[PDB]
Write a protein that binds this ligand. Structure first.
Ligand SMILES: [Zn+2]
Ligand SMILES: [Zn+2]
Ligand SMILES: [Zn+2]
Ligand SMILES: [Zn+2]
Lengths: 188, 189, 189, 189
């Protein structure tokens, strides 16, 4: 049994009127990200929604770098597409988690590692946005914490195609990650 | 300039009808713990309420087998005891006052406490609450390993067992190099 | 998959002429600590010697104000005491045996212990060495927070203070959920 | 009070005959990386050499499947390249200069870097070395999560891939909020 991590696939990151939207490339993965999450859950895997929870926060260095996004209590934090429907169906399940984060990495200042260790999880499966920012930082932390890594290629996206390509190369060649499709089958 | 950490001073830990109550010794520090928290706030310090947030039937938590259900989410058992609860009603919305849910004994474990303290370049933590030999001890040890200067408010920490309370105070002073202070934040000799 | 951790059982902590010696109580566990280590090795367990590596004079270390110089790098005080030292000379080159320098009390703090254990998918640590209420206690608490199952070899841990040794053993069993075992690795009830 | 981090600038990563060499682009920064390190030292900064220390036949290390053997313990591959190596011969024994073995890409992973930095109350790290998109990138991300202000010496970092070098620099500035500086430690606009 593995764990699938769903990173920042919310209105503010995906929708056209989103505060920090990736636009077309992020919208394009909506079908794949929902399909792969449903499949992982059906298999018995743990699902962790790791979602930006921002505040107005003078002490956060990220405030100077990006405009306000994923603000607590706003509709910008709602999950985009059929993924949101999956959460409506199974959000209260013991195997499904909602986790607020303040840094890019899903591990930083959270209890993600603790929850995975409780369940003796050795492999993480990464999905969401952006490939070169919150997926990259999460993957690097996962590597340093000794997890096997899988990346769902058609269920990650970035605003810049060149940055998306760098990150995929980094996952495979530096982190030793397995690149998989929406059916959780290894790509060659 | 500094940060005060308020550890688990809730109804379940302090009140007579508390699910994991420390009883009389925990109740006896109510005046001192509220006094010292108000004083720290008045002089500009950051206040971190680090409170147990447990779920019953959490079979993956090793603590579930060691203690009865306590500080359950949505219950009155998580409410702060005494004038400390009044202080949170008054100033809990101030930018310098925080509420942090925790699952382990240590206030640092699986939380963003270290990140929040580093954002503010805090070098010294002041520890209060219960129990001296469990959630205060674990928090103090984590603080030591993370390079913080440590202050322990002696009249604002308590345990069920006098021998355990005394071990912990000895450990703080002689092994961690912590300063023991009174409810007026003055060094005890 | 289990790993035995051998904490600070060196000349400076054990021998009569040691710089920070626990003396007779530490000397008393020599037979049990060497026996349990050889047994763990025989059973295919990983063995980690986690040993204080201090410098005189380390200005920036908070420990320097609390204790006299001990376990100094390149000195005979860092030599393992008794048959445990003979074991290391025999099997130190084996891929399952490790020597790890540490600067804090905990074996995990600032080391790659957690990394090496995760590489091997170790779920249980077995703790031995000195002192029960300082470098063993700190290692145990870190192990707990990192999700490891814990075993404590009761006859292979020791302290200079008997009351502190008792607190620690109680803390291990009642707070950390650790298993207390003997030198044959059998659970004590 | 700042700390300069010198990452993997050794024979195996830089020299033409190095086992995992970045080649000409890495060799091209030799003048700048030595100059900036000597400058930092003169300004009273701390200097940390954080250097890969791998073992041959380390089957438990995930890196062993990804790259050929490199920076093996006790081999010439671990020797610092260029004037940096001369600087270390001159000032390695100074209390402000450190040598740290590492096994992961990041200088923080499984080391005591964070501990040594907090001991000195360092709030800003200055990064140099190779490769920009691997051990520099991982170190920078770790520094960011640990709340350090970050400076990157642009003419003193290098990669074998120019497009990857460009990505990393953009990532440092736009995502980590790092300051890009030259070999004179002056900000680049
Ligand atoms: Zn954000
Ligand atoms: Zn609890
Ligand atoms: Zn020591
Ligand atoms: Zn390497």
């Amino acid at each position: 049994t593995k764990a699938l991590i769903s990173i920042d696939y919310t209105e503010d990151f995906v929708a056209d009127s989103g505060k920090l939207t990736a636009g077309a490339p992020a919208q394009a993965i909506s079908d794949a990200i929902s399909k792969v999450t449903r499949l992982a859950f059906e298999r018995g895997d743990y699902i962790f929604f790791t979602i930006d929870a921002h505040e107005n926060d003078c002490f956060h260095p990220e405030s100077k770098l990006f405009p306000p996004h994923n603000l607590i209590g706003t509709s910008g934090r709602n999950l985009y597409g059929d993924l949101g429907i999956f959460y409506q169906e199974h959000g209260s399940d013991s195997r499904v988690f909602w986790m607020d984060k303040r840094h890019y990495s899903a591990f930083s200042g959270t209890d993600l590692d603790i929850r995975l260790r409780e369940r003796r999880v050795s492999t993480v499966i990464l999905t969401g946005v952006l490939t070169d920012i919150c997926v990259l930082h999460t993957a690097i932390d996962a590597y340093n914490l000794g997890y096997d890594i899988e990346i769902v290629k058609p269920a990650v996206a970035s605003i810049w195609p060149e940055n998306h390509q760098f990150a995929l190369g980094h996952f495979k060649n530096t982190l030793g990650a397995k690149l998989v499709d929406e059916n959780l089958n290894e790509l060659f």
